[PDB]
Amino acid sequence: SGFRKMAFPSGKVEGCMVQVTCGTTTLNGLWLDDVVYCPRHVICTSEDMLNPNYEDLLIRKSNHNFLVQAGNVQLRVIGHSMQNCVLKLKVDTANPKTPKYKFVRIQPGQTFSVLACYNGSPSGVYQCAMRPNFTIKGSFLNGSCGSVGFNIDYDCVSFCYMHHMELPTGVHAGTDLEGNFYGPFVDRQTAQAAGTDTTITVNVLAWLYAAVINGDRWFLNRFTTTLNDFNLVAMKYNYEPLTQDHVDILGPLSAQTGIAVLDMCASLKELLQNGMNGRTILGSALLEDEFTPFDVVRQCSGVTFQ
Amino acid sequence: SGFRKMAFPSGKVEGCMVQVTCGTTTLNGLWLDDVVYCPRHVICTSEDMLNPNYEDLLIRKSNHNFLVQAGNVQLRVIGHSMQNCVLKLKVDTANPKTPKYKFVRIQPGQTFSVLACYNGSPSGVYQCAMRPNFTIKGSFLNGSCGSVGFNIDYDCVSFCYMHHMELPTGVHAGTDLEGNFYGPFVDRQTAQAAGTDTTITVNVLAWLYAAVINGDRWFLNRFTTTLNDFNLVAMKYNYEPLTQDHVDILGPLSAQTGIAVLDMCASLKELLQNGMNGRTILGSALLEDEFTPFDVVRQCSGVTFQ
Ligand SMILES: Cc1c(Cl)cc(N2CCN(C(=O)c3cc(=O)[nH]c(=O)[nH]3)CC2)cc1Cl
Ligand SMILES: Cc1c(Cl)cc(N2CCN(C(=O)c3cc(=O)[nH]c(=O)[nH]3)CC2)cc1Cl
């Protein structure tokens, strides 16, 4: 029993983190095979932050302008290139700790683990969701750029996020590992704002199923509803509308508890219109939307990895 | 003078189009160096459309199950792999007509050219925009899957779109060339719906500047407005809000015409609240939002490519 904000074990990723220095700027890089990946704004100075021309800035660099350190061992840069917003540094030594990996782009509402790093050294791991406005509510300080987000599927690490910047509202923005930003953001130190966020409805429903599995039942009722009736209430409270695909995804949780999805939607409708009245669910006084249906199954039924 | 829906010259792309057959299914592929890229649902049959397991379907295939034709020359498949939603077929011959290229992921509101193809043969070219709901309003018939979208930057072809499917509403969905879908869609023949579309405001403003450059001035007025006052009216009419970044992008057009952006916004406010009253702008009775500021500059000031 129990329910926690659970991250993936980070060991396979810790061995890929390196320190990348260019000039007076130091941040984190990801070392897979003989390539080091890092944010391209490492080649920027204070004079170029507001409007950098990265093509010009890169042509004025040579391999010896890039210092790469894996712990205390230094890696020799033998080539460099730019792929969208990430810098690819070819080094003379292939990482012997390279795991089975792939580069994936995730969708809003999906979760992943973040290995926060400083000076190439892992500091902590935590779980977060990609928000519908393509930001993440992370925890990052100065020097954390190049930290990566990942999921583990069996023996394979799926890298999905590299950290680039913090927005004025305190939320965080980055790219996939091909260097393409999540959301309408650019790597320039200008004032950019995220659009309005919404609550991830399918995740809230999954979390309510986790509550029932763990013995929190006070919010259930006998009523039922339709998808269109529910979605009418949901839009009023800034909730993402619910699709038939979402209902299918929640199938294994409806079967394990014997509570139909549309039945659980009726409970959620009541919680939105009346609140929780000083009661808690799984130790929270708010509706939690950063657990996917898969996260719940993984924690309330059991999955490990090799 | 004049203003047209202008596409990029397609010659550099026509030489990369091939036909890919697997079983009874034939669609289009993109042949760059010694790799052929195509939608992975080419390995699906009618029995798997609703819920394909692509890992299983691919392990049951061998290289000789894939017939690749470049005109009449046949290409020998020596390897195959899956990267997200695209199939990568390694062939024995590198395309001698491979142009300088890169793979880019575009943002909503940006435009590109589509080379519609059938049986590996180019049929037509047209311009379209990525909608804010991550669909495109294309023109595609049966057999068009694998057609690609592209921009040309100097001598370099930037591939940004590969066509996968048509949604029930008649709009179209696809992936970038790394196989990651635009929008919340999956390559399964289930019922999926696009979210609500909005009008791309910065593009409408660019188009109004093109009108002024070409002698349509009847909608101008002496008034001005603020960003927050404009955005309040815009949201009422399902227009994307306007940012300071957008104002900067429109700079070259404001300078060429001597009409400040916030002045042009005041004209747009009036057109939204009063309509056009049987008058036309650049031969249209509706406000056009599929030309970017760069498209206008390119056509109203002059850019060619090598
Ligand atoms: C072009 C450009 C851009 Cl776009 C960003 C930076 N910065 C690099 C330094 N930096 C952090 O390390 C950091 C991350 C974080 O999440 N929170 C926090 O407080 N600090 C801020 C971003 C520099 C340049 Cl030249
Ligand atoms: C898993 C899967 C998926 Cl997701 C899609 C298809 N289709 C392949 C055939 N096809 C077209 O060629 C087509 C495109 C278009 O835009 N308009 C139109 O009328 N037809 C439809 C999609 C097949 C499979 Cl097995």
Which residue's entry shows tokens 């949780």?
A253
Number of C-beta neighbours around residue A204 at 10 A: 22
Concatenated DSSP letters of B172-209: EEEE-TTSPBSSS--SSSS--------B-HHHHHHHHH
- Of A174, A220, A222, A227, nearest to A40 by C-alpha is A174
Closest chain B CA to residue A106: B180
Q: From start to end of B10-138, where are the E strands? A: 17-22, 25-32, 35-39, 66-70, 73-75, 77-83, 86-91, 101-103, 111-118, 121-129
- At B52, list the tokens: 């394909």
| Termini Cα distance of chain A | 23
Distance of alpha carbon A172 from alpha carbon A136, whole angstroms: 5
Which residue's entry shows tokens 């209902």?
A247
Number of C-beta neighbours around residue A295 at 10 A: 21
CATH architecture, domain defined by A11-91:
Beta Barrel (2.40)
- At A211, list the tokens: 């509550």
Calculate the alpha carbon distances from B239 to A194, B39, B197, B269 in Å.
Answer: 17, 33, 9, 11
Quote the DSSP letter at residue A47. Answer: T
- At A251, list the tokens: 């199938």
Distance of alpha carbon B23 from alpha carbon B19, whole angstroms: 13
Cβ within 8 Å, pair A178-B105: yes
Q: Which residues contact B96 (CB under 8 A, 6 or more apart)?
A: none
Number of C-beta neighbours around residue A111 at 10 A: 23
Q: What is the CA radius of gyration of chain B?
A: 22
A169, amino acid identity: T
The protein residue with its alpha carbon nearest to ligand 1, atom 20, reads: A142
Burial class of residue B188 (count of CB atoms within 10 Å of its CB; 0-12, 13-18, 19+): middle
Q: Are B29 and B18 in contact (CB under 8 A)?
A: yes
Q: How far is A294 from chain B (nearest CA, A)?
A: 17
Number of C-beta neighbours around residue A280 at 10 A: 12
For B76, the 3-state DSSP assignment is coil
- At A210, list the tokens: 């986790």
Calculate the alpha carbon distances from B94 to B32, B98, B159 in Å.
Answer: 7, 8, 18
Q: Which residues contact A81 (CB under 8 A, 6 or more apart)?
A: A87, A88, A90
**Partner residues linked to B18 by β-bridges:** B29
Burial class of residue A193 (count of CB atoms within 10 Å of its CB; 0-12, 13-18, 19+): middle
Strands B101-103 and B156-166: parallel
Distance A49 CA to ligand 1 centre (A): 10
Q: Are B54 and B42 in contact (CB under 8 A)?
A: no
- At B256, list the tokens: 């060429």
Backbone angles phi, psi at A30, to 5 degrees: -115, 120
Concatenated DSSP letters of B38-54: EEGGGG--TTTTTS--H
Q: Are B142 and B178 in contact (CB under 8 A)?
A: no
Q: Are B17 and B115 in contact (CB under 8 A)?
A: yes
Inter-chain contacts counted by CB atoms under 8 A, chains A and B = 29
Q: Are A105 and B180 in contact (CB under 8 A)?
A: yes
Calculate the alpha carbon distances from A4 to A78, A114, A286, B189, B233 in Å.
Answer: 45, 16, 15, 36, 45
Backbone angles phi, psi at A158, to 5 degrees: -100, 105
Which residue's entry shows tokens 């029995």?
B47
Method of determination? Answer: X-ray
Distance of alpha carbon A204 from alpha carbon A129, whole angstroms: 13
Calculate the alpha carbon distances from A180 to A20, A42, A158, B173 in Å.
Answer: 20, 16, 16, 19
Distance of alpha carbon A184 from alpha carbon A280, whole angstroms: 36
Concatenated DSSP letters of A139-161: ---TT-TT-EEEEEETTEEEEEE
Q: Of A83, A178, A184, which is closest to B107 when you measure between CB atoms?
A: A184
Enter the resolution in angstroms. 2.0
Strands A156-166 and A101-103: parallel
Distance of alpha carbon B296 from alpha carbon B4, whole angstroms: 10
Calculate the alpha carbon distances from A2 to A214, A241, A296 in Å.
Answer: 7, 29, 11
Distance of alpha carbon A110 from alpha carbon B194, whole angstroms: 19
B243 to chain A, any CB pair closer than 8 A? The answer is yes
A191, amino acid identity: A
Backbone angles phi, psi at B270, to 5 degrees: -65, -40
* Most informative mutation of A44, A86, A119, A142 for ligand 1 (most atoms within 8 A of CB): A142
- Of B112, B126, B97, nearest to B159 by C-alpha is B112
Distance of alpha carbon B68 from alpha carbon B84, whole angstroms: 21
CATH classification for the domain delimited by B201-301, as one of 1.20.58.100, 3.30.565.10, 1.10.1840.10, 1.10.580.10: 1.10.1840.10
A228 to chain B, any CB pair closer than 8 A? The answer is no
Q: Are A84 and A142 in contact (CB under 8 A)?
A: no
Strands B111-118 and B148-153: antiparallel
**Partner residues linked to B122 by β-bridges:** B117
**Partner residues linked to A32 by β-bridges:** A35
Q: How far is CA B63 from the centre of its chain?
A: 32
The protein residue with its alpha carbon nearest to ligand 1, atom 21, reads: A165
Ligand nearest to the Cα of A52, by number? 1
Ligand nearest to the Cα of B50, by number? 2
Range B253-256, long-range pairs (CB < 8 A, 24+ positions): B253/B206, B253/B209, B253/B213, B253/B293, B253/B296, B253/B297, B254/B209, B256/B209, B256/B213, B256/B300, B256/B301
For A86, the 3-state DSSP assignment is strand
**CB neighbour burial string for B76-112, b if at least 16 within 10 angstroms, e if fewer:** ebeebebbbbbbebebeeebeebbebebbbbbbbbbb
Quote the Cα angle for B45-B51-B55, to 5°.
75
Angle between helix A261-274 and A201-213 (nearest 10): 100
For A129, the 3-state DSSP assignment is strand
List CB contacts (< 8 A) between A84 and chain B: 104-105
Backbone angles phi, psi at A183, to 5 degrees: 85, 180
Backbone angles phi, psi at B296, to 5 degrees: -65, -50
Distance of alpha carbon A211 from alpha carbon A228, whole angstroms: 25
Question: Which positions 71-100 of A are in contact with B (Cβ < 8 Å)?
Answer: 83-84
Backbone angles phi, psi at A143, to 5 degrees: 95, 5
- At A192, list the tokens: 């950019």
Strands B156-166 and B148-153: antiparallel
Q: From start to end of B242-290, where are the E strands? A: none
Quote the DSSP letter at residue B119. Answer: T
Describe the strand order of the beta sheet including A77-83 as a list of residue ranges. A73-75, A66-70, A17-22, A25-32, A35-39, A86-91, A77-83
Backbone angles phi, psi at A96, to 5 degrees: -65, -15
- At A173, list the tokens: 């923005």
